[PDB]
Structures are given as C-alpha cells and as structure tokens.
Amino acid sequence: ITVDEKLDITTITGVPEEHIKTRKARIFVPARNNMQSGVNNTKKWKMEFDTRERWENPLMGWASTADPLSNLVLTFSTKEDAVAFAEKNGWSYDVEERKVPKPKSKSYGANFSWNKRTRVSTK
Amino acid sequence: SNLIEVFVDGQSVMVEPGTTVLQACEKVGMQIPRFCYHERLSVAGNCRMCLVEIEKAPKVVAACAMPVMKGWNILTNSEKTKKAREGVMEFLLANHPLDCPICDQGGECDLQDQSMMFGSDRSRFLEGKRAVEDKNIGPLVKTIMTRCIQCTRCIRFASEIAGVDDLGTTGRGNDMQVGTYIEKMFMSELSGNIIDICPVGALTSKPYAFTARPWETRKTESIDVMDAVGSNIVVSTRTGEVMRILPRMHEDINEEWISDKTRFAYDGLKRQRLTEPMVRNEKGLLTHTTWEDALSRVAGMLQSFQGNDVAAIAGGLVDAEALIALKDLLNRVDSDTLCTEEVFPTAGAGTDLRSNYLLNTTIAGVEEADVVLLVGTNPRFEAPLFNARIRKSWLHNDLKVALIGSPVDLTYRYDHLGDSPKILQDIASGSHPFSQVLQEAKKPMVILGSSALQRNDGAAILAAVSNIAQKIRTSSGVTGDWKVMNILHRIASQVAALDLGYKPGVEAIQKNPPKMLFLLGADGGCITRQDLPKDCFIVYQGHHGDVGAPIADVILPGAAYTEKSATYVNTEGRAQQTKVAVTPPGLAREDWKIIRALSEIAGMTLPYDTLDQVRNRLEEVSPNLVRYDDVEGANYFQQASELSKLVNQQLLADPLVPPQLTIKDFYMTDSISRASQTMAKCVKAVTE
Amino acid sequence: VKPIFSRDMNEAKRRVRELYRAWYREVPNTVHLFQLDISVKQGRDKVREMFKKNAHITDPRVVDLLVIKGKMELEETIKVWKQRTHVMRFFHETEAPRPKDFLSKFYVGHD
Amino acid sequence: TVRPRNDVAHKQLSAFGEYVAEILPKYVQQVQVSCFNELEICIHPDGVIPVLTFLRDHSNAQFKSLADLTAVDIPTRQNRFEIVYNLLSLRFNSRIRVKTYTDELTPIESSVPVYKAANWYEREIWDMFGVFFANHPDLRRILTDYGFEGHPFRKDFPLSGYVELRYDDEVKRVVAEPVELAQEFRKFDLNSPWEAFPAYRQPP
Amino acid sequence: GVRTSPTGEKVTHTGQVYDDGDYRKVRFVGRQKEVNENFAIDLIAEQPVSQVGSRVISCDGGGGALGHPRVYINLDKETKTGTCGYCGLQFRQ
Amino acid sequence: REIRIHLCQRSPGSQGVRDFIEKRYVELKKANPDLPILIRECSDVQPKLWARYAFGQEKNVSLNNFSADQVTRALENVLS
Numbered sequence A: 001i002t003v004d005e006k007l008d009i010t011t012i013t014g015v016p017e018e019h020i021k022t023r024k025a026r027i028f029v030p031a032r033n034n035m036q037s038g039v040n041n042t043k044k045w046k047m048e049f050d051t052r053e054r055w056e057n058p059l060m061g062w063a064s065t066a067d068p069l070s071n072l073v074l075t076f077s078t079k080e081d082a083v084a085f086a087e088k089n090g091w092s093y094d095v096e097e098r099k100v101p102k103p104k105s106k107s108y109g110a111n112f113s114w115n116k117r118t119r120v121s122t123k
Numbered sequence B: 001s002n003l004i005e006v007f008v009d010g011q012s013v014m015v016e017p018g019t020t021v022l023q024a025c026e027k028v029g030m031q032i033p034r035f036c037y038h039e040r041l042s043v044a045g046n047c048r049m050c051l052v053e054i055e056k057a058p059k060v061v062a063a064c065a066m067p068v069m070k071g072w073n074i075l076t077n078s079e080k081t082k083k084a085r086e087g088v089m090e091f092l093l094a095n096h097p098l099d100c101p102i103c104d105q106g107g108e109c110d111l112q113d114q115s116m117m118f119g120s121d122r123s124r125f126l127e128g129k130r131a132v133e134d135k136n137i138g139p140l141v142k143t144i145m146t147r148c149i150q151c152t153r154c155i156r157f158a159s160e161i162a163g164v165d166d167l168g169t170t171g172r173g174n175d176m177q178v179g180t181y182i183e184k185m186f187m188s189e190l191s192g193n194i195i196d197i198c199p200v201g202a203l204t205s206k207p208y209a210f211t212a213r214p215w216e217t218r219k220t221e222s223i224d225v226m227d228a229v230g231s232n233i234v235v236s237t238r239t240g241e242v243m244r245i246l247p248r249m250h251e252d253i254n255e256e257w258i259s260d261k262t263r264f265a266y267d268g269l270k271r272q273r274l275t276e277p278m279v280r281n282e283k284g285l286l287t288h289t290t291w292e293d294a295l296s297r298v299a300g301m302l303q304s305f306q307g308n309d310v311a312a313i314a315g316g317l318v319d320a321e322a323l324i325a326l327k328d329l330l331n332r333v334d335s336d337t338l339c340t341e342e343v344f345p346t347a348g349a350g351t352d353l354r355s356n357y358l359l360n361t362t363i364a365g366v367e368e369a370d371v372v373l374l375v376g377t378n379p380r381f382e383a384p385l386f387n388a389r390i391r392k393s394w395l396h397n398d399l400k401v402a403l404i405g406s407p408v409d410l411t412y413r414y415d416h417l418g419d420s421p422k423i424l425q426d427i428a429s430g431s432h433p434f435s436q437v438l439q440e441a442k443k444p445m446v447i448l449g450s451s452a453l454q455r456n457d458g459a460a461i462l463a464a465v466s467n468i469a470q471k472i473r474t475s476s477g478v479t480g481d482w483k484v485m486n487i488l489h490r491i492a493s494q495v496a497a498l499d500l501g502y503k504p505g506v507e508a509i510q511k512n513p514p515k516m517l518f519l520l521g522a523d524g525g526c527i528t529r530q531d532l533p534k535d536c537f538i539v540y541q542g543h544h545g546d547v548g549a550p551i552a553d554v555i556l557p558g559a560a561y562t563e564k565s566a567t568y569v570n571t572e573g574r575a576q577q578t579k580v581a582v583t584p585p586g587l588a589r590e591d592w593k594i595i596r597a598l599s600e601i602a603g604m605t606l607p608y609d610t611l612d613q614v615r616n617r618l619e620e621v622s623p624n625l626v627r628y629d630d631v632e633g634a635n636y637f638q639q640a641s642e643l644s645k646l647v648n649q650q651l652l653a654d655p656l657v658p659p660q661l662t663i664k665d666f667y668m669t670d671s672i673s674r675a676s677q678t679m680a681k682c683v684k685a686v687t688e
Numbered sequence C: 001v002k003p004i005f006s007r008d009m010n011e012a013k014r015r016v017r018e019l020y021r022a023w024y025r026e027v028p029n030t031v032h033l034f035q036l037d038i039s040v041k042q043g044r045d046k047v048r049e050m051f052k053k054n055a056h057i058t059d060p061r062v063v064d065l066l067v068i069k070g071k072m073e074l075e076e077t078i079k080v081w082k083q084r085t086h087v088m089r090f091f092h093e094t095e096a097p098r099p100k101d102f103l104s105k106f107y108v109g110h111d
Numbered sequence D: 001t002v003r004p005r006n007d008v009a010h011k012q013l014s015a016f017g018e019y020v021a022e023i024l025p026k027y028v029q030q031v032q033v034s035c036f037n038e039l040e041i042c043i044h045p046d047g048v049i050p051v052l053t054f055l056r057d058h059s060n061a062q063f064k065s066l067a068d069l070t071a072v073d074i075p076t077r078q079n080r081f082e083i084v085y086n087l088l089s090l091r092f093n094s095r096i097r098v099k100t101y102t103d104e105l106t107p108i109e110s111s112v113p114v115y116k117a118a119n120w121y122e123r124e125i126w127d128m129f130g131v132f133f134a135n136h137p138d139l140r141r142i143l144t145d146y147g148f149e150g151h152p153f154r155k156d157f158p159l160s161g162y163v164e165l166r167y168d169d170e171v172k173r174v175v176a177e178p179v180e181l182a183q184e185f186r187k188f189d190l191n192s193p194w195e196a197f198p199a200y201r202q203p204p
Numbered sequence E: 001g002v003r004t005s006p007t008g009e010k011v012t013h014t015g016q017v018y019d020d021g022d023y024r025k026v027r028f029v030g031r032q033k034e035v036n037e038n039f040a041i042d043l044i045a046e047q048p049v050s051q052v053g054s055r056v057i058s059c060d061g062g063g064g065a066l067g068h069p070r071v072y073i074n075l076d077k078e079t080k081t082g083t084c085g086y087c088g089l090q091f092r093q
Numbered sequence F: 001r002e003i004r005i006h007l008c009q010r011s012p013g014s015q016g017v018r019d020f021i022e023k024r025y026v027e028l029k030k031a032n033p034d035l036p037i038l039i040r041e042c043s044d045v046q047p048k049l050w051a052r053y054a055f056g057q058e059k060n061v062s063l064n065n066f067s068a069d070q071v072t073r074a075l076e077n078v079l080s
C-alpha cells in the first residue's frame, strides 16, 4: 500500500560546500606496476579524484595540502556501478576504458627454429 | 574450430592450441607464481617456480614449458604443488643476501611478495651464502649482481628485443655471473626498461637511486611528452615531487615499455624551471615582478598592435589546450599568422586532410606488415619505442625491412637501397633493387621520417612518397583496408598543431616579420635577434627555459607535462589525456589559464571559464581530439595524392641524412632534457 | 510497494511551507534569549540564502529527507542546546572568499 | 596439528540454516550464510519488525537481547548500506546476524517496539550514514556537532573533513569554522600483488 | 667539522646554508642552532681498513646485540676496498 | 578565415558528404589556392560545416542528411 514511484535523476542532499562542481573524478582501473609482475591490484575499479595544489610547509619539511577531498580511493565491481555512483555524488566523471592484456601465443618451440629468424641465441 | 576443452581444478575452459599452462590459467583468473615468464618476452624454464601438478603424472611440469593438449586436470592447490612452491623458494633464498633495507626495490619486489604467500615461514639454512662482485654496467643503471637470482630475463631482453647482445651467463653452479665479461659500458636505447624487467633488486635506476619506497609514493597516470610514439607511463609522486616514472602496459603505445630518454630524465623538470614572471628592466637584465604587473606590460602591446604584424611561434612542449587558446587569441583579436617550430611541407595540401598530416598506419599495425620501406630517418635516435615495435615485427614474423637514405646503426637487418634522393625517384618507377618486392607484398608500408622532411627538399621528399605510395597501393598492392604512406613527427607538438590548424614551418614568420611575437615554449632555432629586424618585445611562455628565454622581453612561467592537465596527440593519430601529478613550482600557471588571463587583461576576452569550457571549444575545432584514447583512420588518400602531385619541385643533390645519427645524439635533445643532472652525466660518459 | 519517506510529490512542498513558517517565528527567540550577534533583519535573510541553494526539486524522497534534516538543525535552537554563539553560526564571517573570475583567481592562486 | 582451530558444532548450528528457511517467506529469508559457527541471514528491508518479533520469546529460538546494531557502508552495490542486527541468546547460548539492505535514501522499518535499546543505535546510524528510520521517536544528533554538514562516515567524503580547523580569531567569543586547510595525510599505496587465497576468486 | 657559512649559521650533515634573501633565518636569532659536533662522513674515513685472509667475509656489528643483518661481501676486486651496505667498514684481500 | 567540415565513418550524413569530399574537394583546392580549406574529421559525430569568417567571427551550418548538390551550393554561399 502507498508506493508513489517516481523516476528521476539522483541528487546530493548530504553534500559538503562548493568543491564538488570544480573537482573532476577519474574512474579508471589501476595499472599493474612495472617492477611487480602480479595481477591483483588490477581487475577492480578505483575512483581517484584529481590532485590539487601541494607545497612544502614553512613549519617544518612536510608537504601540506589545503584540498580536503584528495586522499580517498574507492572500490567498485562494475564499470556501470562506478559511473552511476559518480552521478549520484554530483561530481563530473571522465571514465577510462580497461586495457585488457592481449593473448600472445608464446611457445617454447619457436626458440629452436630452422626456417624462422626467431631462434634464441645463447640460451 | 581450433578449440580444446580442459580443466583447471575441475572447471571447464576453452583454449587455442599451442597455448601454455600459465596462459590457460590466466583465462579463469588463476595466477601461478613466476620469475622467468613475461607477457612480451620469450619462454624459458630457468627458475622452475611455476610448477603445477596435473593428475596421473609422476613428475611435476612447469607452466612455462608444456603446451596444453586434450584432457588435463590442472591441480593448483594439491599436496605436491604446495610442497613444490615451498621447496624452490627455500633454494632461491638460500644464496641471496639480507639486503631489503639497503635494496632500492621495496614493496615492488617479486621475491618478497611471493615468499610471504607461497614460500615457507622459516628456512632450514645454516651455513653458506655466496657473494658476487658487482660490475659497473652504466651511469643510468646501478648494478648489484649479489642480489641477482640468475633467472635469465635481462639476457633475453638484450638479445631478442633490445638487440644489443652484451649480457650473458659466465660460469657454472653457484659461481655464475650475469653481465658483460669485457667490462663494456652498456648504453643503448630501451636501457631504462631493463630496470623494470628485473624482478629483484639486482638492476635499478642510478639517477633515482634512493628517494621513496613503492608503497610511499602515490601513483598517477599520464602520457609522456618529448617522444614521437607517446608512451603511457604512471608517474609516482612522493609529497609534491616527481620521484620515479615507470611505464604501464598498453596495446597502442608500442608495448609495456617507455623510452630510455624519457624514463631516466625525471630530474630535468626539477633542476631548472621558471618560477616567477620576469620582465626586462631599464638596466637590461630580466627582473622578477608581480603577476598583475607583468601581465599588464604584455597586454599593453598586445591590445595596441593589430593586423598581420602579430604572429606566434609555438612548438615542442605544447598542449592541445594551449593550441586551442593561442589560436583563439590570435585569429580573433587580429589577423591569423600563427607558426609551428617544426618544418613540415604544406605546398600540396599538407595541413588539409588528416591522411597527409599524420601517419595513416597504426603504431600496433606495424606487426601486420609484409615489407617496410622506410625513408632517410634514424629509428634508433628518434622514437626508441617505435624501433622496438619494428624489431618485434621483424623477430616474430618474417618481414624484410628496407631503409634508404644514409646508413645508420639499427637493431634489425640492413637491406639499404642506396643513399640518394634520386634513388627515391627511381623507386617510384620500375626500380631494380626495389619496387619488385613492393609489388608482390601482402600489406606494404612506407614510413617517412620528419628528420629528412625538415630540410630544403620538403616538397620533393613528399611528392616521392605520394607518387611512390600512389603507384604501389592503388595498382595491385593494397587489397582492402591498408595504409601506404606514413609520417612520424619528431616533435611532440607537431602532430597536434597540424590537426588544430597551425601553419607548419618558420616560413610564415620569415616572409612577414611581426612587431611583437608571443613564442609559447620556443626551443628550436627559428626566432632570434638577427631574425627579427625590429624592437624585440618577445614573450616566452613555457616550462624549463634555457634556450630562447634570454632573448625575451616579458617571460611568463608555465607548467610542464607533469604539471598541466591537457590532451596530447600521438604520431599514429590518437589523443591521450594527461593528468596532473604535481603542483607547478613558484608562481607558474597552467597553459589554458595563461592565455585566458591575457585576454581578460586586454579588451577582447575569449569564451573560457574552466577546463571543461576549453575542452568544449577544442571539440568544435577538431572532433578527433575530443575523444580520449580512441584513434580513427583518415579517408580519401587518392584525392590527397592528386592534389600534392600538381606542384613542381626539383630534388636536392645532398643525400637524405638524419641530424641525429649517433648513440650519444639521442641523450641531450629538444632542450627539455638538456638541462638535466642525469642526462648530462650520461652523455659525458657515452664518449668517455 | 515503494517507500515514500513522509509525503508524495505535492505534500512535500507544503511541509517546506510548514518548515518556513515555523523557522520564521524562531528568529526573535535566537536574538533575545540567545544572543544579539548580528541583526533580526539579517537573520531572516540568512533563511532565504539557505533555501535558494535548494532550488533543485526533482524527487519527493530528496525533499522529505531535507525536511527531516531541517527538523533537527533548526529544531536545535528551539529547544536550546549548547551552542553559545561559537556553534549555530551558518554564515561565514571570519574568512574572506575570492570572486569567480579568470583574472582574479589566476592572480591570487587557484586550480 | 598445532596452530589451527577445530570446529565440531558447525553441523548442529547448520540446522537453523534449514529451520528459519523452512518458514519460507520471500518477504524475509532470501539468502542464508553460515561459517565458523555463526549465522548470517540477509533480509528484505520491507520486513524488519515482523522478522525481529520472531526469534523473540519463540520456544525454539529465544534471543531476547540485541547487543550490536552495526551498519556496513559499501559503494560497490546499488544498495549502499548493509545494516546488521546482531542478536545474542542467553537461554540457548548462540549468536545470530540479521542483515538488511538499504540504498541511498530509503527508510527501513525501525525496531523501536521490538527492542528498547535500538533507538540509541538508530540515532548513531542516522548520524554516521544518513539512513532515516520510519516510526522512530525523537531522532537526534549525538556524535556530530549541532551544526555539522554531511555524514561523518560516508566513503564519499575525506577523512580530514571540511570544517576541521577552529580558530580563536579577531572576534572575541565566536570560534571560526569554515576554513578547510590541514596537514596532509600520507595515504600509503599499500596493496600486495598476487592473490593469496583460493576459493574466493570469481570469474568475470 | 663542517665549514661555517659567511652568513653566520653552521652547516648540517648536508650542505645547508640558508640564502641571504630567504626570510627563514629569524628562527635562529636569539636562540642557538642545534648542530651535531660529531659528523658521520669524517668518521667513516677515520676507521681503519681491516685485512681478510679468505675470499668472502660476513659483516656484523656485534652479534645479536648490535643491529646488523649478516651481509657477505665479495673481495675479488683489488682496487677500491669492499664495504657493506650498513657500516662504513672496509675490507681488503 | 579557414573553412572546416566534419565527416563521419557511418552511413547517414556521410553518403553525400564523402561524395563532396572526393569529387568537389579535389577541385576546391584548385579553385581556391590562397584560402586554406581543411576538413580533418573521422570520429562518429553529426556533420557540420563550421567555417570561420575573416576576423573575429565563426558561423556553423548544418550538413546532416543533406543532398550532394545542396552541399556544393551551401559551400559556395559560405565562401562568398
């Protein structure tokens, strides 16, 4: 009883001060490190916001920042869910496509070739 | 239709015949611990860590070696597979020094992450530990061979992809040293990738050395400038300072490697850069002034002069947001006469049509080529990533490559067809050493370098490529969707300027001298005191000012590639968006904000409020630079070839020789890497 | 079948009218009983600037949630809890903001 | 073997995974989870009061006591909040979890008539998360300031806050609020490569 | 140990002379600058180079008492004495 | 001063636009040698003949689902 179903776009009610409209979100899956050859940081979406101004503090030596919303990393299972959450918050998003590793047929038999020039020299 | 059904822990998976055990496990989501195997490199069963037991077999086989046949139940979490991984890990760390505090690699280390998860908690080890004498390989790569696990991955890297052949195994048993026997100073292209190839802390960056640990620095994705290919590399920042730049895996940008000149030269942006706006004082020397006062002195001349007597010469480290703003400040306020620093032909519809401006064939499309007929250019000096792609296309598949126009050192074979512009004219007709191979080919491609194009014979080299490409592809060569002619621009901004609507070359400034020139990031020798025959009033706007900065009246500081967040065009024709990693030093501002504030100080104000407003205006001028990381091929190549052939020009007598034709030549170039502590140390040791 | 919070579409606007009616009568109570601070006229202008930000009415759920939130942040001063002029001061007076301009923000230091 | 823990009462406790499920409403049960002698039941938001009247004074399951009323905030799902009612039996000596799901802004049926302790934890969820509860008497801010914006826990906004810095400036009595500058939190990018655990990885 | 600046304030372990135009010098007006008398750079060269009979020697501070991970150093090179990553101690032969 | 035209890889709005790009554009370079006419577009978007005026002005004309004869007539009027 009493449903009152209304279809409309999501809006921010519990929102902070004027900083959401200026800052742009970059919902992109984190790339694997150059040295570490393991895929575990990948296959999970991360919504990291663009970094603002940073300067060395006159108090000591640390680099203090005025920008509050900067040091947060969110997790998402689907690309459609991350895009819907960004619209729900209010901030404009620039989504990047996931770069999947291409399947390359790396066979051991190619190392000892006769006709082909793909023969491995000195082991 | 060439598919085999096999079981990983009892779960069904369909695989192509010829694929390895590890390749089949990647399909379901499993990842077997590895040390030798790499996605780009070849296969070797050296370490024997990727052991995985398949049922009904007495011996455990490696994931590297075995190709998957019909009917295998690969057990990853059996009693023997766990004991195999725990066993070998104890052998790997028995003769490996306790160096984790003094090691340059921290959390990124492959031995650390794997030994904690797969290896045993405690070691049986009591006495032993071998010690290896370290060999000084180069000033760019620090080498401590004590920590090396003799995995044989760098040796394969230098032999198969880099093509230098210096590293090799010497000795037997424990006494085996990886490296060059003759103590030769190893310096070549792609040498800044061998630090990332090595899984352990044996090979590390000497300019970086010790600054931050992998977990401490926050990673940020950006497209690398000052390179033709435009490789993607995640720049790491440790509290408002760029510490290390490491490449990320990408299909379009060659491979999972960055250029040697791009990766090692991280300190170049931090050593010398303009911090405060400097205006020319009454005495003579440039002095630091307020931002409101320095802009007012620049706006006083800019608003006063009108017509064809105002022209901007920009090229080098220029962005797409800078290109859209400078064109809106020049063409709207006065008459448009904006020029590019890099010389490019525009006589026979050069700027018009996207097929003539940029390379038609994709950067990844070099692998699917029958024969590469390259023009007079050095691939080793200009774009090391593209030279690696051409070598990988030569190693994996049989494709005869020909490079005509001054012989130079290359990783591939040879097959040079002389060293003359007349030989290129003979190649268009029925040639004897060439043409016959070009006629009988599946998909031939001709790559014309910008190194020879920026000379006296600009139109002559362009007509030979259009006449040669038009007679080959349209007649019998191309059978469907295939590219014939390619142009790889040396400068980073040259590919972006031609697409936007800038006049290429310094000929526009040479024909009509301007009164006041606002040269945005002037690096090349185009504008000088002898070149301009009037009162200077030159405005220099760009990060790292060493050349061009002394010959300026009002210099405004700008942000570098790591500073400003704007799009950049690739050689293939792809717009890659760069993100801001660190704040600009001093009172320096962004490229899009610098031109908008100049218009606001003057009478005529440009329609721009934010970065989104500048992106919308850039989308209206060119739709190709609107979509990020999406490249589209240009149509009508035969129409462009007919328009270019109408112009008549005589061929030059001098051979098509590249300006950079040495191993030491590609160290200090394009002024951005010239003011560096790392690059100058490398260049001095290259000759000595 | 679906939750409606408090009201459906039209009645939610009348709850805002009910909220504005109650909060307009409470500004003399936040001066005489609480503290003078600024002014009675400026206190009523402080109400208008708060509701001008909420011009984006699109859902009955969003409006009603703001009403319930409004029946706590403005109900705090009716049954007087510990604020003592330091708290319950919505208008920024201590800090001076930079105006939105291409010439003003670039001269000072922004983005 | 020394070092791991042994379980034997798992099968005896798994009977409730059938018992409450055999009542069989689409209104209540949905999904039942049981691991390391603890039960997790996730229940549709429309029924919470009729669910908690059950397991209370029932002859087979006599809990009577509510210890925890924790809430899980997770941005991955369309239903953002996973409110967990943790119950404890003193007669049978067993613990059960009554999980629920609520999206961005939807009221759940609050357990004020069922439990007299719930109201204090119900105010805590409305503060930290912003999840409004229907049929609740006197919903007030406890942990937050009397002039606080947003909801303190929500993963949308930073750890440092927005009105963090408070000066005793030029004004004699008024303590400043809207200044947003603070010392930088070193967010360490620590996340180990290679998956350490089998029987957890899912195919795409 | 370290050379004194023309301005006044003493240099630390690294070459840290404050600029003449820099305002961050008021801190040391009135109250003294804390600079260590013993400099570590000069103390490395002060310690004598020890002789080794065998090919490979293991470095230690003083067992488990003094903090040092056991690192084995190769002594095949004649020129430039081999040193561990932790101490400034050098070894010959 | 320079004229710009947008062309798509798709079928609608590019059936007549590519016909003007192959038959008319080759003659357009010969007809107008001094005035630069650059039409560099390949991305999937609605076609528009946005051409800039002599000084401080830009006018955009719609070219979506336009005839091949109509496209040549509109380009001639914009050039004058």
Ligand code: SF4
Residues within 6 Å of the ligand: B096, B097, B098, B099, B100, B103, B104, B105, B106, B109, B110, B111, B112, B147, B200, B201, B202
């Ligand atoms: S390579 Fe890894 S395990 Fe070896 S010392 Fe370095 S950090 Fe430690």
Ligand code: SF4
Residues within 6 Å of the ligand: B147, B148, B149, B150, B151, B152, B153, B154, B155, B178, B197, B198, B199, B200, B202, B203
């Ligand atoms: S130096 Fe590194 S990459 Fe080369 S063999 Fe040793 S461990 Fe492998």
Ligand code: FES
Residues within 6 Å of the ligand: B033, B034, B035, B036, B037, B044, B045, B046, B047, B048, B049, B050, B062, B063, B064
């Ligand atoms: S990783 Fe397969 S044998 Fe070393």
Ligand SMILES: [Zn+2]
Residues within 6 Å of the ligand: E059, E060, E061, E068, E084, E085, E086, E087, E089
């Ligand atoms: Zn030591």
